[PDB]
Design a protein around this ligand. Structure first.
Ligand SMILES: [Mg+2]
Ligand SMILES: [Mg+2]
Ligand SMILES: [Mg+2]
Ligand SMILES: [Mg+2]
Lengths: 196, 204, 233, 222, 222, 121, 4, 212, 198, 198, 196
């Protein structure tokens, strides 16, 4: 699995591949690892499928209920819920999650919760087995306050590499754009990303 | 299962003023069972003494071994072997089996016929020579013995005095060790003479 | 029953005539991968106490929340919050200590080594350590993980025994600490260059320095070394 | 896997004279090979003229002490400030300890003071409650080293009266407090020489009808 | 064990503590950790006591011969290669961690050898359980162009670090100096900062204290 | 959950529910027992309000608590059964732990204590 | 063996 | 540890060593291995020191309660079964104790029961328990006769321990003797094996292989 | 393990049981009665782990003596055993199973016929002419298979057991210090005080 | 393990050894002679693992008879034993150590005195008045320690053993089917055909 | 340990960090992982220090003896030697080595022998713990036939990154240049490589 979230001028972009394996067999080549927990707060899933799906569903609830009672939820909160679930149930979970969202007051924000159950806010984050291979590229090509077009590229490249090297990753690249104007679903096929 | 502890046993030796002493207990058992109370652990080759704690069969073997080796030495050199030297022979003889040691812990004491300075030394199961000008211990009650010694000892003690000292250290240290005791012997050494005395002690 | 994941290395500290100093880098290692580079491991508690934590980070973040709690809950029905009934390091320590031990006894420990450093109401310096085992100790210098082995030896050359405390000055102390940090950068494979440091003086109060870096490093000699023995060029 | 125990080394010792009792322990605290502190007391005063030490695993050590001190507190409350006799403090601790028979306090503990008839006394415990009143006892890392010495210089074991053809034991005279300290210091210096865990310092707590006195001597910090 | 080596402007020096230990009990309060390979090639070692001595002699021997057969003064790189190939041969079972240095026709030299057979070179090195302590000092006070006297302090300071802050090390400090044109000097017990304070009492037992059962003399000469 | 205090005290110091139970006794058939020098006997009258019974089976007024101890009563036949069973059990629970059948005072002190409990629970 |  | 208790004419005999060990370590030579339950009941210790000391001191309490509860002295059969049943509750938890419960009651006569952490309870006449049991059993079986005199009997035990102490490295220190009659129990000294061995050797003439 | 045997003849049931209690290295007692009278015409013998053994048998005793009282009646063996099987089968999936095997034999005063039941620690029950537990059966069955007959007089049975015990004494590693025999019949239960030689 | 006992009186040495070979579940033989005559004035008894036991004894027999011939002389016990110790001590660090314990008793026609040597599978030798191997010593020593005397007639010894065997037959878990005793003295070696009762 | 070899116009360049660790301790901070096996044939060492030093020493001999008898050796040969050792003794070794050399007929050539003992010839190769983090950057920034100045850079960056993410690597960067003109010893310190 190869996933990352990047914050930019207009807001934020999450991207991931689409491969779920059970060993070295490809169970699902079209998986959507970008899950919605709210109109404008999403997450990228890495680790055990089940553990992740379950954790996510439980957060969509906790937020849906938050909403009804107190309006639109902040991202710091969306994270807190995740952290809580992951940290509190550490012995039985193997899920590393990246939360990304868009607020009118805070623009874009990215939080990452790694296996331990810690929460980290940062300009960008990557995770998934395939991420070992791009700590280099990314730290090297990432500039703060990029444009949508620029960011989709950065992401498109970083991951294409990750897919190149890690066999636990492949399929297609998926991205989701979070901005004032809305929510956009972007997809990229092999024939494009491979030769770059 | 700890070979060094099946049989049990203790040995200690101390330096004095123009004299040295070495002693040991007479127990020989198997785990909890006492079997023999006449297992002397101090052997002598000429004017050099060597006591051996540890597994009984190895004690025996090594003893036999050094008789052989020391005997040839005297023939080949037409002179009786000296401590400083004998020690080195012991060290090499043990390390020779560095990967399958004899589970023992030899202690050596005697005097140089030529120079007169008293000499004592000990080793771990693989030959590391422990040279100390004061005292050496070995056996299941090593911890105890050390304790006794380090406290009781003072430099330049006379034959009559040193005897008291070593005896207590043995005796007392033995009494706090389940695997040691059942008797005890003490060797007092001087350039010309050597006396062997047996001690009275608990038999439990 | 657990195994730490994201971790933070050494924490060093020593005390001096007018207070204490403590420091720790800003890193969170995910095993051999030096993952996070903007981690503050020095947690201030009020204006008279700093708690430094090494070990598992997630747990640290918890001990963070626990503290903010301790703070709030003390102000409650306490008119003397910002004065005579404010939290004292001894309180903060004894609590944490208590917690750590309860957790080891329940077999679900907080994988940490924590040094609580500060000054009391009456002025006395305070420095004590507690780790995942509820083991508590105090000494003119304290450290966790590697620092244990390397920092202590250095810092102890400044304050060998209690009597040396009233003879050591901030400049001296701070130099020592910084150094230890440097050395640690040389040898700890899990350290980082960017660190943090803070002092707690019975007069100036609390001073906290962020974004510190190691400087005055000696690396030039590495040019005269080639091959592993017989190589000449 | 998480191992819930540690070993801070250390060593302590208690001796009881006709009318006083002593309890000492090194002041070093270790972890594997490093030294945690050269001065961390482990012999405490719990009120009611009772000194006590729990040597083994520090944490478990500090705990017991806490639980006991507190017990004493509640004793007074629940019994009109009645003074807790040592023989009683003993039985209490047996209960504290055995309370955890299946998750023991990894410590060898000793406490000392005066009994009802005013004579001095000492009791030592198994890390799970076996208790007995003894003349003297050493415990911890260098227990194996020092115990023998005591059996000798205190209970006069193996010593005999000169010239009696080994048929008369040295009469059991009793050590003066001053003479007792001598033994302690020596027992420690000797311990320091052969035990890497022992060293740094010696703190001695002394007990008599007049209260509780403390004495401190330096040791080899190597 | 704490051993170090420091190179200086026209030579090299090495040092070490003197504590030998079986587990936590000091076995030799002043054992020698410096070994003469050839007159001007000295080696220092930590690990299993036996192996540091053995591998040192065995090579000192094979070297001595080698020299005679070549009518030349030995070379460090030779001792080095000789040591390493031997250790590596033994897949690490020979617990010898060695710091080897000396002077020979080609200049001065300093290296280190781990029991698995890997070598390193540098201007200062240390090894042993006290490794970290000293190394701290070294990294704290070293600089290039050290004189003979500045270096000796340096190497010394470093050992002291080990002694004080590492239970596995202690007692005295041994130093050896190898300069380009002079004979090498072996300074055994350069420092003795751990002397035993006079004991408090003398246990000179009145004679007769011990009970004897049988008494005899032994025959030595033939 | 039901725990209302039914046996409480009233202004004059009597416990109604208890005193009342007594009255229930007074309505049950009589029963008697008297002891000799080497034996003891118990007698009882049979309720004749309804007659045409089968003696063979009907709970005999005298029940065996153990091969050596009996118990008879006057009162709500039903209540007796509970008392008897609780008693028979302690009869074995005692043999089993003391290796000796119950003395009559003990058995009694048991049954009674059982009764006392029900007057303040 | 001895450490040584 | 070697403990023994046996039955005859003038009552019951009970003797035990006084050594406790932590492996090879002689933790103590001055251990009391006989719990004075109450003026008429006695228990012996073998297995873990604490487990024994604690649970017997405890038995003492459950006994005192029974007395107040029925104004009658508790039987040994009962006093034993208490400990027994207790111990069986904790079965499998790691308790290690082998012990004898000895007493004289108007009802049962003199009686002894074996009770161990395994949960076995046995009524018997002679019993030895401990690492050194075998050695004592030896001496006993051969010299036991129901017609023994209290003077003789006390000796037979003292000796039997002595036998065991000599051989079994885990036993020894000193011997604590006890005699049981309806008027309660009577102590018969703490004999240091240090001084006792020799005396016996000389007078009886045995332990010849020893030299002295 | 210890020895437990049973044999049902025409008018009775005989149970034999080793008289020894061994522990680790020593034989602690040479006169153990490994049996309990459940009810005046029902006897149960047992063999198994140390404590569980007695503990279990005494429990069944209580629970049966209790019924006998509550009802002024005596349960038939087919019933007592069934009860016992249920208690055992109940525990096998318990936290700490009773590790006991029992042989139960009684006389059915109502059917006026004798009966013997074998049940192992798992609650395996089965009615049989003769039976045993543990290793014992291994030497004895052959003998019984051979020399047994339904219309056997009681005397004929004691000789058969003797023949059995003899074989066991001849070929069995451990010394069980002999047995204790008991006969269950219309007149109740009696212990044959003469089996050390007959 | 089997039973091996020995006791040296004033004018001889007596050896007692159980007569049973047990295999897993059965007792295969009730008449084993666990001993071999090394030389006309020396006997060795042995106990240990299934096969090593005889193999080792017969080997020692051979290597000793051979010496007996090559020199027209009989080796002293102190020697025969020392020989045996070395053979054992040799094997302990071999691919498959002989797992046998032996008792060796012989009469020294030269010193005109009897001797008994005990050596365990590791080559641990020691001279003793009486000895045993395995667990047997656990029961007997106390007796011997007690009822033993250097100036004992031969008859006094056999009774002593009898008292020993007795203790064993009473307190030992496994049935060893009795013993076979043999005495070694100036006139040679003889087997006491009467020990099933004396 | 992070090492790599890159071939270019003028020849080839070998580069490595300088950290050998025992567990988490830095044993040596100035190690040389670039070892000579011949005037113009060198290698990069990663894995067991013992195993590598040994393997090199044995090669140097093998080639020095080769020379004496048959003149200057080709690189394909220097490699085959290593292969032979590494493959033949696989069960007892944990050493991954990269071999780089310069010939007048073949220009620059790079071979890599990974834990298994297989030999691989390629434009460039990287290895060691810290390599995991740059398969990306490198695959993205390497261009064939670069100039010396360009290559030193490419190499300086790739490793600087590896040193950043992997703690089993650090110290200084060492490079060795192999061309017709000779052999050059390049070294690079922290204060420079860290901020790029
Ligand atoms: Mg792919
Ligand atoms: Mg004993
Ligand atoms: Mg009181
Ligand atoms: Mg010390």
């Amino acid at each position: 699995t190869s996933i990352m979230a990047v914050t930019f001028k207009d807001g934020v972009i999450l991207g991931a591949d689409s491969r779920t394996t059970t060993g070295a067999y490809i169970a699902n080549r079209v998986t959507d690892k970008l899950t919605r927990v709210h109109d404008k707060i999403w997450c990228c899933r890495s680790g055990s499928a089940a553990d992740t799906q379950a954790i996510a569903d439980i957060v969509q609830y906790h937020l849906e209920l938050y909403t009804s009672q107190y309006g639109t939820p902040s991202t710091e909160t969306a994270a807190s819920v995740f952290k809580e679930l992951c940290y509190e149930n550490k012995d039985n979970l193997t899920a590393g999650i990246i939360v990304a969202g868009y607020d009118d007051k805070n623009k874009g924000e990215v939080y990452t919760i790694p296996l331990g159950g810690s929460v980290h806010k940062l300009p960008y984050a990557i995770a998934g087995s395939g991420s070992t291979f791009i700590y280099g590229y990314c730290d090297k090509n990432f500039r703060e306050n990029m444009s949508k077009e620029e960011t989709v590229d950065f992401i498109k490249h970083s991951l294409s590499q990750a897919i190149k090297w890690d066999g636990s990753s492949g399929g297609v690249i998926r991205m989701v754009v979070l901005t004032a104007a809305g929510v956009e679903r972007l997809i990229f096929y092999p024939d494009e990303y491979e030769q770059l | 299962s700890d070979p060094s502890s099946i049989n049990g046993g203790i040995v200690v030796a101390m330096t004095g003023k123009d004299c040295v002493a070495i002693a040991c207990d007479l127990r020989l058992g198997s785990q909890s069972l006492g079997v023999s109370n006449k297992f002397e652990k101090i052997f002598h080759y000429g004017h050099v003494f060597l006591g051996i704690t540890g597994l009984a069969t190895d004690v025996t073997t090594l003893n036999e071994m050094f008789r052989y080796k020391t005997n040839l030495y005297k023939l080949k050199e037409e002179r009786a072997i000296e401590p400083e030297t004998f020690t080195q022979l012991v060290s090499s003889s043990l390390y020779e089996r560095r990967f399958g040691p004899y589970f023992v812990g030899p202690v050596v004491a005697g005097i140089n016929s030529k120079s007169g300075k008293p000499f004592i030394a000990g080793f771990d199961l693989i030959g590391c020579i422990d040279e100390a000008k004061d005292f050496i211990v070995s056996g299941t009650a090593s911890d105890q013995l050390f304790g006794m010694c380090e406290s009781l000892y003072e430099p330049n003690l006379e034959p009559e005095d040193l005897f008291e000292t070593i005896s207590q250290a043995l005796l007392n240290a033995a009494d706090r060790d389940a695997l040691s005791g059942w008797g005890a012997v003490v060797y007092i050494i001087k350039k010309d003479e050597v006396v062997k005395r047996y001690l009275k002690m608990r038999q439990d | 029953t657990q195994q730490p994941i994201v971790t933070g290395t050494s924490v060093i500290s020593m005390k001096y005539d007018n207070g204490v100093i403590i420091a720790a880098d800003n890193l969170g290692s995910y095993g051999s991968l030096l993952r996070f580079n903007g981690v503050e491991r020095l947690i201030p508690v009020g204006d008279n106490t700093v708690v430094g934590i090494s070990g598992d980070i997630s747990d640290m973040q918890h001990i963070e929340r626990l503290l903010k709690d301790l703070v709030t809950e003390n102000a409650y029905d306490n008119p003397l919050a910002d004065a005579e009934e404010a939290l004292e390091p001894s309180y903060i320590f004894e609590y944490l200590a208590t917690v750590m031990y309860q957790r080891r006894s329940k077999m679900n420990p907080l994988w940490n080594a924590i040094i609580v450093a500060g000054v009391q109401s009456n002025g006395d310096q305070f420095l004590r350590y507690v780790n995942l085992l509820g083991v508590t100790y105090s000494s003119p210098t304290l450290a966790t993980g590697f620092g244990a082995h390397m920092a202590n030896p250095l810092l102890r050359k400044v304050v060998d025994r209690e009597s040396d405390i009233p003879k050591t000055t901030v400049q001296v102390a701070e130099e020592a600490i910084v150094n230890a940090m440097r050395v640690l950068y040389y040898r700890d494979a899990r350290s980082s260059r960017n660190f943090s440091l803070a002092i707690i003086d019975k007069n100036t109060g609390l001073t906290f320095k962020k974004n510190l870096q190691v400087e005055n490093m000696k690396w030039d000699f590495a040019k005269d070394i080639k091959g592993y023995g017989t190589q000449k060029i | 896997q998480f191992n819930p125990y540690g070993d801070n080394g250390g060593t302590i010792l208690g001796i009881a004279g006709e009318d006083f009792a002593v309890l000492a322990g090194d002041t070093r605290n270790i972890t594997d090979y490093s030294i945690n502190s050269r001065y961390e007391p482990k012999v405490f005063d719990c009120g009611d003229n009772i000194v006590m030490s729990a040597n083994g695993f520090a944490a478990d050590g500090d705990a017991l002490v806490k639980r006991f001190k507190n017990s004493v507190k509640w004793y007074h409350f629940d019994h009109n400030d009645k003074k807790l006799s040592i023989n009683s403090a003993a039985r209490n601790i047996q209960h504290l300890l055995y309370g955890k028979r299946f998750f023991p306090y990894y410590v060898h503990t000793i406490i000392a003071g005066l009994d009802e008839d005013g004579k001095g006394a000492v009791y030592s415990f198994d890390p799970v409650g076996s208790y007995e009143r003894e003349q003297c006892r050493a415990g911890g890392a260098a227990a194996s080293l020092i115990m023998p010495f005591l059996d000798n210089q205190v209970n006069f074991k193996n010593q005999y009266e000169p010239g009696t053809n080994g048929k008369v034991k040295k009469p059991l005279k009793y050590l003066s407090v001053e003479e007792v300290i001598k033994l302690v210091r020596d027992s420690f210096t000797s311990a320091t020489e052969r035990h890497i865990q022992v060293g740094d310092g010696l703190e001695i707590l002394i007990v008599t009808k007049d209260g509780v006195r403390k004495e401190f001597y330096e040791l080899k910090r190597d | 064990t704490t051993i170090v080596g420091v190179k200086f402007n026209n030579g090299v020096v090495i040092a070490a503590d003197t504590r030998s230990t079986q587990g936590p009990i000091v076995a030799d309060k002043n054992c020698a950790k410096l070994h003469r390979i050839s007159p001007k090639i000295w080696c220092a070692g930590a690990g299993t006591a036996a192996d540091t001595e053995a591998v040192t002699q065995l090579i000192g021997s094979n070297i001595e011969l080698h020299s005679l057969y070549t009518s030349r003064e030995p070379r460090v790189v030779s001792a080095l290669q000789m040591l390493k190939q031997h250790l590596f041969k033994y897949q690490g079972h020979i617990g010898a961690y060695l710091i080897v240095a000396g002077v020979d026709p080609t200049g001065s030299h300093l290296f280190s050898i781990h029991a698995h057979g890997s070598t390193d070179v540098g201007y200062y090195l240390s090894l042993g359980s006290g490794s970290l302590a000293a190394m701290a000092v070294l990294e704290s006070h070293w600089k290039q162009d050290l004189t003979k006297e500045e270096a000796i302090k340096l190497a010394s300071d470093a050992i002291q670090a080990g002694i004080w802050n590492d239970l596995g090390s202690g007692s005295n400090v041994d130093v050896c100096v190898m300069e380009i044109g002079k004979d090498a000097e072996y300074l055994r017990n350069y420092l003795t900062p751990n002397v035993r304070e006079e004991k408090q009492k003398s246990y000179k037992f009145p004679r007769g204290t011990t009970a004897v059962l049988k008494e005899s003399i032994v025959n030595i000469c033939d | 959950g039901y725990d209302r205090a039914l046996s409480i005290f009233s202004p004059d110091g009597h416990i109604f529910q208890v005193e009342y139970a007594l009255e229930a006794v007074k309505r049950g058939t009589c029963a008697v027992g008297v002891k000799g020098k080497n034996c003891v006997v118990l007698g009882c009258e049979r309720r004749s309000t309804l007659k045409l019974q089968d003696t063979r089976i009907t709970p005999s007024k005298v029940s065996k608590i153990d091969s050596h101890v009996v118990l008879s009563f006057s009162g709500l036949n039903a209540d007796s059964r509970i008392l008897i069973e609780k008693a028979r059990v302690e009869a074995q629970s005692h043999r089993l732990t003391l290796e000796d059948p119950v003395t009559v005072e003990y058995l009694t002190r048991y049954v009674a204590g059982v009764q006392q409990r029900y007057t303040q629970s | 063996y001895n450490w040584x | 540890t070697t403990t023994l208790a046996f039955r005859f004419q003038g009552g019951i005999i009970v003797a035990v060593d006084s050594r406790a060990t932590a492996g090879n370590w002689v933790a103590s030579q001055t251990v009391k291995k006989v719990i004075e339950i109450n003026p008429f009941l006695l228990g012996t210790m073998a297995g873990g020191a604490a487990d024994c000391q604690f649970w017997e001191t405890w038995l003492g309490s459950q006994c005192r309660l029974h007395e107040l509860r029925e104004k009658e002295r508790i039987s040994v059969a009962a006093a034993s079964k208490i400990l027994s049943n207790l111990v069986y509750q904790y079965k499998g938890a790691g308790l290690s104790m082998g012990t004898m419960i000895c007493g004289y009651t108007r009802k049962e006569g003199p009686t002894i029961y074996y009770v161990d952490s395994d949960g076995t309870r046995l009524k018997g006449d002679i019993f030895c328990v401990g690492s050194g049991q075998t050695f004592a059993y030896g001496v006993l079986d051969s010299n036991y006769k129901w017609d023994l005199s209290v003077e003789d009997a006390l000796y037979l035990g003292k000796r039997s321990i002595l036998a065991a102490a000599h051989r079994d490295a885990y036993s020894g220190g000193s011997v604590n003797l006890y005699h049981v009659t309806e008027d309660g129990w009577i102590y018969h000294g703490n004999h240091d094996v240090g001084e006792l061995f020799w005396k016996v050797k000389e007078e009886e003439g045995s332990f010849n292989n020893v030299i002295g | 393990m210890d020895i437990i045997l049973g044999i049902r003849v025409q008018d009775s049931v005989i149970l034999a049981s080793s008289k020894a209690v061994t522990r680790g290295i020593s034989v602690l007692k040479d006169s153990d009665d490994k049996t309990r009278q459940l009810s005046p015409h029902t006897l149960m013998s047992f063999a198994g782990e140390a404590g569980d053994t007695v503990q279990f048998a005494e429990y069944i005793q209580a629970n049966i003596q209790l019924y006998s009282i509550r009802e002024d009646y005596e349960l038939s063996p087919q019933a007592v055993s069934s009860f016992v099987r249920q208690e055992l089968a109940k525990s096998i999936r318990s936290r700490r199973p009773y590790q006991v095997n029992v042989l139960i034999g009684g006389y059915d005063k109502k059917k006026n016929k004798p009966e013997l039941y074998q049940i192992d620690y798992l609650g395996t029950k089965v009615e049989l002419p003769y039976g045993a537990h543990g290793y014992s059966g291994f030497y004895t069955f052959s003998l019984l298979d051979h020399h047994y007959r339904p219309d056997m007089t009681t005397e004929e049975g004691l000789d058969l057991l003797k023949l059995c015990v003899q074989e066991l004494e001849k070929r069995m590693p451990m010394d069980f210090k002999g047995v204790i025999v008991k006969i269950v019949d219309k007149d109740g239960i009696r212990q044959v005080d003469d089996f050390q030689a007959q």
